[PDB]
Amino acid sequence: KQTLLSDEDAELVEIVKERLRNPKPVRVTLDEL
Amino acid sequence: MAYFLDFDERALKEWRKLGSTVREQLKKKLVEVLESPRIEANKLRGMPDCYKIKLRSSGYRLVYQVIDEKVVVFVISVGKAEASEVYSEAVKRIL
């Protein structure tokens, strides 16, 4: 089949977990963006 | 919106540093996930709670996490990250 996920994901996992430990989420909507 | 929208503080600044039309594309890809965010096709490799959306032509991407407890799409990363030049440039410290 081959995966839809790839070697890009290998980088995205380190970025997400990095910020995840202390990102500070701000509650918004798309209309206000 | 079924799911609410949340953004990482760094990610707020991330959309500001990229093209205006680029962020709007991401926003529309967000309105659809805010209805149904579990797009298993776009799942990340390692984090089952996270998915990646990407812009076919623009080359930018967005990574979000689906928080069911708080019912919110929490975008963690916005901008360009990739596979290609990650290998090409690789490092800048220890060769």
Structural domains in chain B, CATH included, are 1-95 (3.30.2310.20)
Report the domain count for chain A: 1
Contact map slice: A 1-33 vs B, CB within 8 A: 3-13, 15-17, 19-20, 23-30, 33
CA B1 and chain centroid, separation: 18
User: Counting beta carbons within 10 angstroms of the beta carbon of residue A3, is it exposed (0 to 12), middle (13 to 18) or buried (19 or more)?
Assistant: exposed
Owning domain of residue A14: 1-33
Backbone angles phi, psi at B73, to 5 degrees: -90, 105
Nearest Cα to B35, choosing from B10, B74, B4, B81? B4
- Determined by NMR
Retrieve residue A8's tokens. Answer: 């890009």
| Span between the terminal Cα atoms of chain A, in Å | 38
| Distance, CA of B37 to CA of A16 (rounded, Å) | 17
